[PDB]
Amino acid sequence: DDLSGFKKIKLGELELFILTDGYIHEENLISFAPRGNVAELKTILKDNFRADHYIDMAINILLVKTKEKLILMDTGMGIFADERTGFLLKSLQKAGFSAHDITDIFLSHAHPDHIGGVVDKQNKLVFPNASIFISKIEHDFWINASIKDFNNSALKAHPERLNQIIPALQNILKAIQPKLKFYDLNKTLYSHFNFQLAPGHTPGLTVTTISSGNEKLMYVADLIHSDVILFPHPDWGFSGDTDLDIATASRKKFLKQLADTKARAFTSHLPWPGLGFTKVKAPGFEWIPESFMN
Amino acid sequence: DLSGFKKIKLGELELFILTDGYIHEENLISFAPRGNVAELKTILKDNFRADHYIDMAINILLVKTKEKLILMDTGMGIFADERTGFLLKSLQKAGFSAHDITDIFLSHAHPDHIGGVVDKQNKLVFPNASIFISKIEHDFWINASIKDFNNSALKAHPERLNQIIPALQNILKAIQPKLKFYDLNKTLYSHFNFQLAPGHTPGLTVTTISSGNEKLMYVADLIHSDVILFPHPDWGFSGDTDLDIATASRKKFLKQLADTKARAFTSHLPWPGLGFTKVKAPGFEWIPESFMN
Ligand SMILES: [Zn+2]
Ligand SMILES: [Zn+2]
Ligand SMILES: [Zn+2]
Ligand SMILES: [Zn+2]
């Protein structure tokens, strides 16, 4: 019933806490990977002993405790939560923290399942002491977004949904304006964090690298939404991508980079705890989850 | 603090996977006696694992039925090092004390499974629990000698065997008054069925847990590495009492799991030890169960 939880890991100087907001039970598989083969999609699910009539997407969130900061990377569904989501604050509590402890929030992008937790249902800030970072491009996009921005998206099939969600996101952006900062894409922040754009899923989707000594972790957020489908088939796309073609280009760039460098990634939506490695495997890539003893 | 638990549902049953900690094997030469370190290291690197040690989990299953609370194996207990012996802390996190346990099912009598049944004064840790073991397993360790290990990698360590055998015998003596032998031909407590998978030890017992439409197979020490011993089950494991019999059992039960697409629970594969088996000729592949939390 209570879907909250955390996992603590060490990253050199840093303490990391992986938090869960819950999960998304996606039952509409015809458009999950819009450019894919729906027979092959279900074969892959069954070859991995999973259900073939839905895909459960995790909502994994990273909390980073540095020497003087406590940083939350994304905030889950918040006001958009259903009964399977909105567990972030319970997870944070289990990890030993309350909302007032958070000093900084890094938003990877402004989708409902990432920005929803920054306010409550009266548009009041949840994290009273936190600066909130977003890319300038991401902000610029959503404050003026409309239906016609989604013509290269599977979402174009849902204009009524879009016409609901866009003003809701705009209202959140208005509420957080007094806390808002834009990433500097060319400077290290707080000694540990570097930011770069990976456009396509949204125009300003930001990937964060966390560094301590010879340890690096890349939070790639919504670059990829399925371990078993979109690593071998990155050109199949994802239902929520704002621009399918541009999202495919970013997905391929970062998968290639993760494979070439053997770097560990943290992901929003792959199975818990969302940590793993990327290898080339014709005709695409393969996700190798990190292994744990507990 | 390496303690922790995961709760899952199986039909009407509540299952809690508990950790005792982990075993850090820092020398790869002994790990898979009929393999080789170059090929082993290649597999570890190919899976982004450390290439100079292997960590083995110690996963333990707690089953809450409508009238009983069953612990399947007990971790290192009196044999614990700094990374093991966390079972009671995990049990507490899951919501239970030692006094709550009604039954313990031992898969086999190795130190990392039977060590937790007594304390260092050889007093029972679980005062209200019956303890089950296979008759063959019991009779082996009561009567074992060094020569019985001549088809084990453990034959390289006769001093260690001469310490371990009496230590295990002392535990078997302490739990004697609570000890029952499995009936391999009947369902116990409406949920449990037992069968042997000899070789790792002569009386290694595999337990099937069932409720409603669901079944889970606790295969205990059938297999010790997900990435090594599924593709190469004939490489063996350092702790197997008889390497040839253990290989045959390993291949038999991996084939059954593959053919039936059944879920297994394992003592030593990465946390939480749950997963599926697929043929990947000439061997197998482990597909860990995927979770949202
Ligand atoms: Zn998104
Ligand atoms: Zn998302
Ligand atoms: Zn054993
Ligand atoms: Zn064992």
Coordinates of C-alpha atoms and ligand atoms in Angstrom, one line a residue:
Chain A
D1 CA 0.0 0.0 0.0
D2 CA 2.7 2.4 1.1
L3 CA 5.1 2.4 -2.0
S4 CA 7.7 4.6 -0.4
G5 CA 11.3 3.6 0.0
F6 CA 14.9 4.6 -0.3
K7 CA 18.4 3.2 -0.9
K8 CA 21.5 4.8 0.4
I9 CA 24.7 4.6 -1.6
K10 CA 28.1 6.2 -1.4
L11 CA 29.7 8.2 -4.2
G12 CA 33.1 9.2 -2.9
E13 CA 32.7 12.4 -0.9
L14 CA 28.9 12.2 -1.4
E15 CA 26.0 10.4 0.2
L16 CA 23.3 9.5 -2.3
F17 CA 19.8 8.4 -1.5
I18 CA 17.7 6.9 -4.3
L19 CA 14.0 7.7 -3.5
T20 CA 10.8 6.4 -5.1
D21 CA 7.7 8.5 -5.9
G22 CA 5.9 5.3 -6.8
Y23 CA 5.2 4.0 -10.3
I24 CA 3.3 4.5 -13.5
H25 CA 1.1 1.6 -14.7
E26 CA 1.0 2.2 -18.5
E27 CA -1.6 0.2 -20.3
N28 CA -1.6 1.9 -23.6
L29 CA 1.0 -0.1 -25.4
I30 CA 0.0 0.7 -29.0
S31 CA 1.8 4.1 -28.7
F32 CA 4.4 3.3 -26.0
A33 CA 7.1 3.1 -28.6
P34 CA 5.4 4.8 -31.5
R35 CA 7.8 3.9 -34.3
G36 CA 8.2 0.3 -33.1
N37 CA 6.9 -3.2 -33.9
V38 CA 4.1 -4.0 -31.5
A39 CA 4.5 -7.8 -32.0
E40 CA 8.2 -7.6 -31.2
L41 CA 7.5 -5.3 -28.3
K42 CA 5.3 -7.9 -26.6
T43 CA 7.8 -10.7 -27.5
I44 CA 10.6 -8.8 -25.7
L45 CA 8.4 -8.3 -22.6
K46 CA 7.5 -12.0 -22.5
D47 CA 11.2 -13.0 -23.2
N48 CA 12.0 -11.1 -20.0
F49 CA 9.1 -12.8 -18.0
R50 CA 7.2 -9.6 -17.8
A51 CA 3.5 -8.9 -18.4
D52 CA 2.8 -8.1 -22.1
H53 CA -0.3 -6.0 -21.6
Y54 CA 1.2 -3.1 -19.5
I55 CA 4.6 -1.6 -18.7
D56 CA 5.3 -0.4 -15.2
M57 CA 7.6 2.6 -15.2
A58 CA 9.4 3.5 -12.0
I59 CA 9.8 7.0 -10.7
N60 CA 13.3 7.1 -9.2
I61 CA 14.5 10.4 -7.7
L62 CA 18.1 11.2 -6.6
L63 CA 18.9 13.0 -3.3
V64 CA 22.5 14.1 -3.0
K65 CA 24.0 15.2 0.3
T66 CA 27.2 17.2 -0.2
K67 CA 29.2 18.8 2.5
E68 CA 26.9 21.9 2.7
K69 CA 24.0 21.1 0.4
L70 CA 21.0 18.7 0.1
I71 CA 20.0 18.4 -3.5
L72 CA 16.9 16.8 -4.9
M73 CA 16.9 15.8 -8.6
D74 CA 13.3 16.0 -9.7
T75 CA 10.2 15.8 -7.5
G76 CA 7.8 13.1 -8.8
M77 CA 4.1 13.5 -9.6
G78 CA 3.1 15.7 -6.7
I79 CA -0.2 17.4 -7.6
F80 CA -0.6 15.1 -10.5
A81 CA -0.3 11.9 -8.4
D82 CA -2.6 9.0 -8.5
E83 CA -2.8 6.3 -5.8
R84 CA 0.4 4.7 -7.1
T85 CA 2.5 7.9 -7.1
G86 CA 3.2 11.0 -4.9
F87 CA 5.3 8.9 -2.4
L88 CA 8.3 11.2 -2.6
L89 CA 7.8 12.9 0.8
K90 CA 7.3 9.5 2.5
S91 CA 10.5 8.2 0.9
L92 CA 12.4 11.3 2.0
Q93 CA 11.1 10.8 5.5
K94 CA 12.3 7.2 5.5
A95 CA 15.7 8.5 4.3
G96 CA 15.9 10.8 7.4
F97 CA 14.9 14.2 6.0
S98 CA 12.0 16.6 5.8
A99 CA 11.1 19.1 3.1
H100 CA 12.7 22.0 4.9
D101 CA 16.1 20.3 4.7
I102 CA 16.3 20.5 0.9
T103 CA 18.5 23.4 -0.2
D104 CA 18.3 22.9 -4.0
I105 CA 16.0 21.2 -6.5
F106 CA 17.4 20.4 -10.0
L107 CA 14.6 19.9 -12.5
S108 CA 15.6 17.8 -15.5
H109 CA 12.5 18.9 -17.4
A110 CA 9.0 20.2 -16.6
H111 CA 6.9 17.2 -17.3
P112 CA 4.2 16.4 -14.6
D113 CA 6.1 13.4 -13.2
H114 CA 9.2 15.5 -12.5
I115 CA 7.9 19.0 -11.6
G116 CA 4.6 18.0 -9.9
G117 CA 6.1 17.7 -6.4
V118 CA 7.3 21.3 -6.1
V119 CA 3.9 22.7 -5.1
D120 CA 0.8 21.5 -3.3
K121 CA -2.8 21.7 -4.6
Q122 CA -3.0 25.3 -3.6
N123 CA 0.1 26.2 -5.5
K124 CA 2.2 26.7 -2.4
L125 CA 5.8 25.7 -2.3
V126 CA 6.6 22.4 -0.7
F127 CA 10.3 22.9 -0.1
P128 CA 10.5 26.3 1.7
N129 CA 14.3 26.6 1.6
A130 CA 15.1 25.3 -1.8
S131 CA 16.3 27.1 -4.9
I132 CA 14.8 25.5 -8.0
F133 CA 16.9 25.1 -11.2
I134 CA 15.7 24.5 -14.7
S135 CA 17.2 25.0 -18.1
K136 CA 16.4 28.4 -19.7
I137 CA 15.2 26.6 -22.9
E138 CA 12.9 24.3 -20.9
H139 CA 11.4 27.2 -19.2
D140 CA 11.0 29.2 -22.4
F141 CA 9.3 26.3 -24.1
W142 CA 6.6 25.6 -21.5
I143 CA 5.7 29.2 -20.7
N144 CA 4.5 29.6 -24.3
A145 CA 3.7 26.0 -25.2
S146 CA 0.5 25.1 -27.2
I147 CA -1.0 22.2 -29.1
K148 CA 0.9 23.1 -32.3
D149 CA 4.2 22.3 -30.5
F150 CA 3.3 18.6 -30.4
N151 CA 2.8 17.8 -34.0
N152 CA 6.0 15.7 -34.0
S153 CA 4.8 13.9 -30.9
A154 CA 2.6 10.9 -30.2
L155 CA 0.8 13.3 -27.8
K156 CA -0.8 15.0 -30.8
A157 CA -3.5 12.3 -30.5
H158 CA -4.5 13.8 -27.2
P159 CA -5.3 17.5 -27.7
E160 CA -7.8 17.6 -24.8
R161 CA -5.1 16.2 -22.5
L162 CA -2.6 18.7 -23.8
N163 CA -5.0 21.6 -23.3
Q164 CA -5.3 20.4 -19.6
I165 CA -1.7 19.7 -18.8
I166 CA -0.1 22.7 -20.4
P167 CA -1.9 25.4 -18.3
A168 CA -1.3 23.2 -15.2
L169 CA 2.5 23.2 -15.9
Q170 CA 2.4 26.9 -16.6
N171 CA 0.7 27.5 -13.3
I172 CA 3.4 25.6 -11.5
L173 CA 6.1 27.6 -13.3
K174 CA 4.4 30.8 -12.2
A175 CA 4.3 29.6 -8.5
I176 CA 8.0 28.7 -8.4
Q177 CA 9.2 31.9 -10.1
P178 CA 10.5 33.4 -6.8
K179 CA 12.9 30.3 -6.3
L180 CA 13.8 29.9 -10.0
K181 CA 17.4 29.7 -11.3
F182 CA 18.6 28.7 -14.8
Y183 CA 21.5 26.2 -15.2
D184 CA 24.8 27.5 -16.4
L185 CA 25.7 24.8 -18.9
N186 CA 29.4 25.7 -18.9
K187 CA 30.3 25.8 -15.2
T188 CA 30.6 23.3 -12.4
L189 CA 28.0 24.0 -9.7
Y190 CA 28.9 23.3 -6.0
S191 CA 32.0 21.4 -7.1
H192 CA 30.1 18.3 -8.1
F193 CA 27.5 19.1 -10.7
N194 CA 27.7 19.6 -14.5
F195 CA 24.8 20.2 -16.8
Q196 CA 24.2 19.6 -20.5
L197 CA 21.2 19.6 -22.7
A198 CA 19.7 16.4 -24.4
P199 CA 16.9 18.0 -26.4
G200 CA 14.0 16.1 -27.9
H201 CA 12.0 14.5 -25.1
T202 CA 11.4 18.1 -24.2
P203 CA 13.4 21.0 -25.7
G204 CA 15.4 21.7 -22.6
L205 CA 15.8 18.2 -21.0
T206 CA 19.0 18.5 -18.9
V207 CA 21.4 15.7 -18.0
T208 CA 23.4 16.1 -14.8
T209 CA 26.8 14.6 -14.1
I210 CA 27.7 14.1 -10.5
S211 CA 31.5 13.9 -9.8
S212 CA 33.6 12.9 -6.8
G213 CA 37.2 11.9 -7.4
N214 CA 37.3 9.1 -9.9
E215 CA 33.6 8.4 -9.4
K216 CA 31.0 9.8 -11.8
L217 CA 27.3 9.2 -12.1
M218 CA 25.2 10.5 -14.9
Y219 CA 21.5 11.3 -14.2
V220 CA 20.0 10.9 -17.7
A221 CA 16.4 11.4 -16.5
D222 CA 14.0 10.7 -19.4
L223 CA 16.5 9.9 -22.2
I224 CA 15.1 6.4 -22.2
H225 CA 11.9 4.8 -20.8
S226 CA 12.4 1.0 -21.1
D227 CA 15.4 -1.2 -20.4
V228 CA 14.4 -4.1 -22.6
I229 CA 12.7 -2.3 -25.5
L230 CA 14.5 1.1 -26.1
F231 CA 18.1 0.0 -25.5
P232 CA 18.0 -2.4 -28.5
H233 CA 15.6 -0.2 -30.4
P234 CA 16.3 3.5 -29.6
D235 CA 14.7 4.7 -32.8
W236 CA 11.3 3.3 -31.7
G237 CA 10.7 6.4 -29.7
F238 CA 8.6 7.1 -26.6
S239 CA 4.9 8.2 -26.4
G240 CA 5.8 11.2 -24.2
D241 CA 8.7 12.6 -26.4
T242 CA 7.9 16.2 -27.6
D243 CA 9.8 15.7 -30.8
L244 CA 10.4 12.0 -31.8
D245 CA 13.2 12.6 -34.2
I246 CA 15.2 14.9 -32.0
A247 CA 14.6 12.7 -29.0
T248 CA 16.0 9.7 -31.0
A249 CA 19.1 11.7 -31.9
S250 CA 19.7 12.6 -28.2
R251 CA 19.0 9.0 -27.1
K252 CA 21.5 7.6 -29.5
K253 CA 24.2 10.2 -28.6
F254 CA 24.0 9.5 -24.9
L255 CA 23.7 5.7 -25.2
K256 CA 26.8 5.8 -27.4
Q257 CA 28.7 7.9 -24.9
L258 CA 27.7 5.8 -21.9
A259 CA 28.8 2.7 -23.8
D260 CA 32.1 4.2 -25.0
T261 CA 33.0 5.5 -21.5
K262 CA 31.6 2.6 -19.5
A263 CA 29.9 5.2 -17.3
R264 CA 27.2 4.4 -14.7
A265 CA 23.8 6.1 -15.3
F266 CA 20.9 6.9 -13.0
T267 CA 17.5 6.8 -14.7
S268 CA 14.0 8.1 -13.7
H269 CA 11.9 5.3 -15.1
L270 CA 13.9 2.1 -15.5
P271 CA 13.4 -0.6 -12.8
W272 CA 14.5 0.1 -9.2
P273 CA 16.9 1.5 -8.2
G274 CA 17.5 2.8 -11.8
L275 CA 21.3 2.4 -11.7
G276 CA 23.2 0.6 -14.5
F277 CA 25.6 0.4 -17.4
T278 CA 25.3 0.6 -21.1
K279 CA 26.9 -1.8 -23.6
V280 CA 26.8 -2.0 -27.4
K281 CA 24.7 -5.0 -28.5
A282 CA 23.6 -5.2 -32.2
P283 CA 21.3 -3.7 -33.4
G284 CA 21.5 -1.2 -30.5
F285 CA 22.5 -1.3 -26.9
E286 CA 21.8 -3.3 -23.7
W287 CA 21.2 -2.1 -20.2
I288 CA 23.2 -3.9 -17.5
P289 CA 21.6 -3.2 -14.1
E290 CA 24.0 -2.6 -11.2
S291 CA 24.0 -5.6 -8.8
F292 CA 23.5 -5.2 -5.1
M293 CA 23.8 -7.3 -1.9
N294 CA 20.8 -5.5 -0.2
Chain B
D1 CA 24.1 -1.7 9.1
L2 CA 23.6 -4.1 6.2
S3 CA 20.2 -5.3 7.4
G4 CA 17.1 -4.9 5.3
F5 CA 13.9 -6.6 4.0
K6 CA 11.5 -6.7 1.1
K7 CA 7.9 -7.7 1.4
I8 CA 6.1 -9.5 -1.4
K9 CA 2.7 -11.3 -1.7
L10 CA 2.3 -14.9 -3.0
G11 CA -1.3 -15.8 -3.2
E12 CA -2.6 -15.5 0.4
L13 CA 0.9 -15.6 1.9
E14 CA 3.1 -12.7 3.0
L15 CA 6.7 -13.2 2.1
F16 CA 9.6 -11.2 3.5
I17 CA 13.0 -11.5 1.9
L18 CA 15.6 -10.8 4.6
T19 CA 19.4 -10.3 4.3
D20 CA 22.0 -11.7 6.6
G21 CA 24.7 -9.6 4.9
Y22 CA 27.1 -10.8 2.2
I23 CA 30.1 -12.9 1.6
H24 CA 33.1 -11.1 0.0
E25 CA 35.1 -13.7 -1.9
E26 CA 38.4 -11.9 -2.7
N27 CA 40.1 -14.8 -4.4
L28 CA 38.8 -15.9 -7.7
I29 CA 41.1 -18.9 -8.2
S30 CA 39.0 -21.1 -6.0
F31 CA 35.6 -19.8 -6.9
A32 CA 34.6 -22.0 -9.8
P33 CA 36.9 -25.1 -9.6
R34 CA 36.5 -26.3 -13.1
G35 CA 36.5 -22.9 -14.8
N36 CA 39.4 -20.5 -15.3
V37 CA 40.1 -17.0 -14.0
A38 CA 40.8 -15.4 -17.4
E39 CA 37.3 -16.4 -18.7
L40 CA 35.7 -15.6 -15.4
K41 CA 37.2 -12.1 -15.3
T42 CA 36.1 -11.5 -18.9
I43 CA 32.5 -12.3 -17.9
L44 CA 32.7 -10.1 -14.8
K45 CA 34.1 -7.2 -16.9
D46 CA 31.4 -7.7 -19.6
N47 CA 28.8 -7.2 -16.8
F48 CA 30.5 -4.2 -15.3
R49 CA 31.3 -6.1 -12.1
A50 CA 34.5 -5.9 -10.1
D51 CA 37.0 -8.3 -11.8
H52 CA 39.0 -9.3 -8.7
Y53 CA 36.3 -10.5 -6.2
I54 CA 32.8 -11.8 -6.1
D55 CA 30.2 -10.7 -3.6
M56 CA 27.6 -13.3 -2.7
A57 CA 24.4 -12.2 -1.1
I58 CA 22.8 -14.1 1.9
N59 CA 19.1 -13.9 1.1
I60 CA 16.7 -15.6 3.6
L61 CA 12.9 -16.2 3.2
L62 CA 10.3 -15.5 5.9
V63 CA 6.8 -16.9 5.1
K64 CA 3.8 -15.7 7.1
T65 CA 0.9 -18.2 6.7
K66 CA -2.4 -17.8 8.5
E67 CA -1.2 -19.6 11.6
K68 CA 2.6 -19.9 11.2
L69 CA 5.8 -17.9 10.7
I70 CA 8.5 -19.8 8.9
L71 CA 12.1 -19.0 8.4
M72 CA 14.0 -20.6 5.5
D73 CA 17.6 -20.8 6.6
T74 CA 19.3 -18.5 9.2
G75 CA 22.4 -17.0 7.9
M76 CA 25.9 -17.1 9.4
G77 CA 25.0 -16.6 13.1
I78 CA 27.9 -17.8 15.2
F79 CA 30.1 -17.9 12.2
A80 CA 29.4 -14.3 11.3
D81 CA 32.1 -11.8 10.3
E82 CA 31.7 -8.0 10.0
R83 CA 29.6 -8.3 6.9
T84 CA 27.2 -11.1 8.0
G85 CA 25.0 -12.1 11.0
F86 CA 22.4 -9.3 10.2
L87 CA 19.4 -11.7 10.1
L88 CA 17.9 -10.7 13.4
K89 CA 18.2 -7.0 12.6
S90 CA 16.5 -7.6 9.2
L91 CA 13.8 -9.7 10.9
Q92 CA 13.2 -6.8 13.3
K93 CA 12.9 -4.3 10.4
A94 CA 10.3 -6.6 8.8
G95 CA 8.3 -6.4 12.1
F96 CA 9.2 -9.6 14.0
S97 CA 11.3 -11.0 16.8
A98 CA 13.0 -14.3 17.3
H99 CA 10.2 -15.5 19.6
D100 CA 7.6 -15.1 16.8
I101 CA 9.2 -17.8 14.6
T102 CA 7.2 -21.1 14.7
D103 CA 9.3 -23.2 12.2
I104 CA 12.7 -23.1 10.6
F105 CA 13.4 -25.0 7.4
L106 CA 17.0 -25.7 6.8
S107 CA 18.0 -26.2 3.2
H108 CA 21.3 -27.7 4.2
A109 CA 23.7 -27.5 7.2
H110 CA 26.5 -25.2 5.8
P111 CA 27.7 -22.4 8.2
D112 CA 25.9 -19.7 6.2
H113 CA 22.5 -21.4 6.5
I114 CA 22.6 -23.1 10.0
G115 CA 24.8 -20.7 11.9
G116 CA 21.9 -18.6 13.1
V117 CA 20.0 -21.3 14.9
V118 CA 22.1 -21.1 18.1
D119 CA 24.0 -18.4 19.9
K120 CA 27.6 -18.6 21.1
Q121 CA 26.5 -20.5 24.2
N122 CA 24.9 -23.1 21.9
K123 CA 21.4 -21.9 23.1
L124 CA 18.5 -21.8 20.6
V125 CA 18.0 -18.4 19.1
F126 CA 14.4 -19.1 18.2
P127 CA 13.0 -20.7 21.4
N128 CA 9.6 -21.5 20.0
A129 CA 10.6 -22.9 16.6
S130 CA 10.6 -26.5 15.3
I131 CA 13.6 -27.1 13.0
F132 CA 13.4 -29.2 9.8
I133 CA 16.3 -30.7 7.8
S134 CA 16.5 -33.6 5.4
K135 CA 17.4 -36.9 7.0
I136 CA 20.2 -37.4 4.4
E137 CA 21.7 -34.0 5.2
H138 CA 21.6 -34.7 9.0
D139 CA 23.1 -38.1 8.6
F140 CA 25.9 -36.9 6.4
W141 CA 27.2 -34.2 8.7
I142 CA 26.9 -36.4 11.9
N143 CA 29.1 -39.0 10.1
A144 CA 31.3 -36.9 7.8
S145 CA 35.0 -37.2 7.5
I146 CA 37.7 -35.6 5.3
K147 CA 37.6 -38.5 2.7
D148 CA 34.0 -37.6 2.0
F149 CA 35.3 -34.4 0.3
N150 CA 37.7 -36.0 -2.1
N151 CA 35.5 -34.8 -5.0
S152 CA 35.3 -31.3 -3.6
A153 CA 37.6 -28.3 -4.1
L154 CA 37.4 -28.3 -0.2
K155 CA 39.9 -31.2 -0.2
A156 CA 42.6 -28.5 -0.5
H157 CA 41.7 -27.3 3.0
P158 CA 41.7 -30.3 5.4
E159 CA 42.6 -28.1 8.4
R160 CA 39.5 -26.0 7.7
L161 CA 37.3 -29.1 7.2
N162 CA 38.6 -30.5 10.5
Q163 CA 37.4 -27.3 12.2
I164 CA 34.0 -26.9 10.3
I165 CA 32.8 -30.5 10.6
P166 CA 32.8 -30.6 14.5
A167 CA 31.4 -27.0 14.6
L168 CA 28.4 -28.1 12.5
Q169 CA 28.1 -31.3 14.5
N170 CA 27.9 -29.2 17.7
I171 CA 25.1 -27.2 16.3
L172 CA 23.2 -30.3 15.1
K173 CA 23.6 -31.7 18.7
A174 CA 22.2 -28.5 20.2
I175 CA 19.1 -28.4 18.0
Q176 CA 18.4 -32.2 18.3
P177 CA 15.3 -31.8 20.6
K178 CA 13.6 -29.5 18.1
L179 CA 14.7 -31.3 14.9
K180 CA 12.3 -33.0 12.5
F181 CA 13.1 -34.6 9.1
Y182 CA 11.3 -33.5 6.0
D183 CA 8.7 -35.8 4.5
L184 CA 9.6 -35.5 0.8
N185 CA 6.2 -37.0 -0.2
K186 CA 3.7 -34.7 1.5
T187 CA 2.6 -31.1 1.5
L188 CA 3.5 -29.4 4.8
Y189 CA 1.2 -26.8 6.4
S190 CA -0.8 -26.5 3.2
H191 CA 2.0 -24.5 1.4
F192 CA 5.3 -26.3 1.3
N193 CA 6.8 -29.2 -0.7
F194 CA 10.3 -30.5 -0.4
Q195 CA 12.7 -32.4 -2.7
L196 CA 16.4 -33.1 -2.8
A197 CA 19.0 -31.6 -5.1
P198 CA 22.1 -33.4 -4.0
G199 CA 25.7 -32.5 -4.7
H200 CA 26.3 -29.1 -3.1
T201 CA 25.7 -31.2 0.0
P202 CA 24.1 -34.7 0.0
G203 CA 20.8 -33.6 1.4
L204 CA 20.4 -30.1 0.0
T205 CA 16.6 -29.5 -0.1
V206 CA 14.7 -27.4 -2.6
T207 CA 11.4 -26.0 -1.2
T208 CA 8.4 -25.0 -3.3
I209 CA 6.0 -22.5 -1.7
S210 CA 2.5 -22.4 -3.0
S211 CA -0.7 -20.5 -2.5
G212 CA -3.6 -20.0 -4.8
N213 CA -2.4 -19.8 -8.4
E214 CA 1.2 -18.9 -7.5
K215 CA 4.3 -20.9 -6.7
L216 CA 7.9 -20.0 -5.8
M217 CA 10.9 -22.4 -5.7
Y218 CA 13.6 -21.7 -3.1
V219 CA 16.6 -23.4 -4.7
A220 CA 19.0 -22.3 -1.9
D221 CA 22.6 -23.2 -3.0
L222 CA 21.9 -24.8 -6.4
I223 CA 23.9 -21.9 -8.0
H224 CA 26.2 -19.2 -6.7
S225 CA 26.7 -16.7 -9.5
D226 CA 24.2 -15.2 -11.9
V227 CA 26.6 -14.2 -14.6
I228 CA 29.1 -17.1 -14.3
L229 CA 27.3 -20.3 -13.4
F230 CA 24.1 -19.9 -15.5
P231 CA 26.2 -20.0 -18.8
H232 CA 28.8 -22.4 -17.3
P233 CA 27.0 -24.6 -14.8
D234 CA 29.7 -27.3 -15.2
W235 CA 32.4 -24.9 -13.7
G236 CA 31.1 -25.7 -10.2
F237 CA 31.5 -23.9 -6.9
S238 CA 34.3 -24.1 -4.3
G239 CA 31.8 -25.2 -1.6
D240 CA 30.2 -28.0 -3.5
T241 CA 30.7 -31.3 -1.6
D242 CA 30.7 -33.3 -4.8
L243 CA 31.4 -31.3 -8.0
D244 CA 30.0 -33.9 -10.4
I245 CA 26.7 -34.6 -8.6
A246 CA 26.3 -30.8 -7.9
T247 CA 26.7 -30.1 -11.7
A248 CA 24.1 -32.7 -12.6
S249 CA 21.6 -31.2 -10.1
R250 CA 22.3 -27.7 -11.2
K251 CA 21.6 -28.6 -14.8
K252 CA 18.5 -30.6 -13.9
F253 CA 16.8 -27.8 -11.9
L254 CA 17.9 -25.0 -14.3
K255 CA 16.3 -27.0 -17.1
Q256 CA 13.1 -27.4 -15.0
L257 CA 13.0 -23.7 -14.2
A258 CA 13.5 -22.8 -17.9
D259 CA 11.0 -25.3 -19.2
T260 CA 8.3 -24.2 -16.8
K261 CA 9.1 -20.5 -16.8
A262 CA 8.9 -20.7 -12.9
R263 CA 10.2 -18.1 -10.6
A264 CA 13.0 -19.0 -8.2
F265 CA 14.4 -17.6 -5.0
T266 CA 18.1 -18.0 -4.3
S267 CA 20.4 -17.7 -1.3
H268 CA 23.3 -16.1 -3.0
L269 CA 22.4 -14.3 -6.2
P270 CA 22.2 -10.5 -6.1
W271 CA 19.4 -8.9 -4.0
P272 CA 16.6 -9.7 -3.7
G273 CA 17.5 -13.1 -5.2
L274 CA 14.3 -13.5 -7.2
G275 CA 14.3 -14.4 -10.9
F276 CA 13.7 -16.5 -14.0
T277 CA 15.7 -18.9 -15.9
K278 CA 16.0 -19.1 -19.7
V279 CA 17.9 -21.4 -22.0
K280 CA 20.8 -19.7 -23.8
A281 CA 22.6 -22.6 -25.5
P282 CA 24.7 -24.5 -24.3
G283 CA 23.7 -23.1 -20.9
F284 CA 21.3 -20.8 -19.2
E285 CA 20.7 -17.1 -18.4
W286 CA 19.3 -15.6 -15.2
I287 CA 16.7 -12.9 -15.7
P288 CA 16.3 -11.0 -12.4
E289 CA 12.7 -10.0 -11.4
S290 CA 12.1 -6.3 -12.0
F291 CA 10.7 -4.1 -9.3
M292 CA 9.4 -0.6 -8.9
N293 CA 10.8 -0.3 -5.3
Ligands
ZN1 ZN 9.3 13.4 -19.3
ZN2 ZN 9.3 11.2 -16.8
ZN3 ZN 26.1 -24.2 1.0
ZN4 ZN 25.3 -21.0 1.1

